[PDB]
């Protein structure tokens, strides 16, 4: 397929061009900063970002070549991981703070306003510090985001027909191509072979932590829903429900 024939430079260029816009939150300093108010800001932002995430996913090489059911499956698995890795990336330049949006930069003491949130904040902040330690580059970030989209749901992806088996193999081939692209970027940047392999591993281990934080955030969001802390959009309810 055309997508599976792209070069590393073409893959990276495509992912850079697909980057979504950075949206603003509803934050008003005049509002009492209650648990419900803060959670309303975060869920409202996530809802609006999800629409742009769908447009981004359709630009990841090969993604639109899968069936609609396949695309739904991968996004249902990965959506909160994708939001959170974007959050960590935006926060790199702001030690001690999480840049949810340009007008919504929160520290851990503000996170304490929501029950159970400071623990999540601390994980996200630690991951942002790791990004800083590594001097993570935008080309590396966009490859990681595409990897999340294709990988998080791929073990549960069904291959019960010849066509679905073919599509599953196509996903794995594209994951290999994104690895090739990451390695190509790191080689062009001057790293030795040993440094390239070490950094590839450092970058992919980030994804274990992103998964962990997504799972913790999803459990927290479910708790908020059950406790009726804030109203959630129909889309968020459906995405939440796809995680049982």
């Amino acid at each position: 397929s055309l997508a599976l024939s792209l070069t590393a430079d073409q893959i990276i260029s495509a992912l850079l061009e697909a980057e979504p816009p950075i949206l603003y939150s509803e934050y008003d300093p005049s509002r009492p900063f209650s648990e419900a108010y803060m959670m309303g800001l975060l869920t409202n932002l996530a809802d609006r970002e999800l629409v742009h995430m769908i447009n981004w996913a359709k630009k990841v090489p090969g993604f639109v070549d899968l069936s609609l059911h396949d695309q739904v499956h991968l996004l249902e698995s990965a959506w909160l991981e994708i939001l959170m890795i974007g959050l960590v990336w935006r926060s790199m330049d702001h030690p001690g703070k999480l840049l949810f949006a340009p007008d919504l930069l929160l520290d851990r003491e503000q996170g304490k306003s929501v029950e159970g949130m400071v623990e999540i904040f601390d994980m996200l902040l630690a991951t942002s510090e790791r990004f800083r330690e590594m001097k993570l580059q935008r080309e590396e970030f966009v490859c990681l985001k595409a990897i999340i989209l294709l990988n998080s749901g791929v073990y549960t992806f069904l291959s019960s027909t010849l066509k679905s088996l073919e599509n599953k193999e196509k996903i794995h081939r594209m994951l290999d191509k994104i690895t090739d692209a990451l390695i190509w970027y790191m080689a062009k940047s001057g790293l030795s072979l040993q440094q390239q392999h070490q950094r590839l591993a450092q970058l992919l281990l980030i994804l274990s932590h992103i998964r962990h934080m997504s799972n913790k955030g999803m459990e927290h969001l479910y708790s908020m829903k059950s406790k009726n802390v804030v109203p959630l959009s129909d889309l968020l309810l459906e995405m939440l429900d796809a995680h049982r």
């Binding site: 629409v51 769908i54 359709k58 609609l68 695309q71 739904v72 996004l75 249902e76 129909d234 889309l235 459906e238 995405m239």
Partner: peptide
Amino acid sequence: KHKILHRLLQD
């Protein structure tokens, strides 16, 4: 087919 996500991926 009635999922919102399914509709957004088509539109």
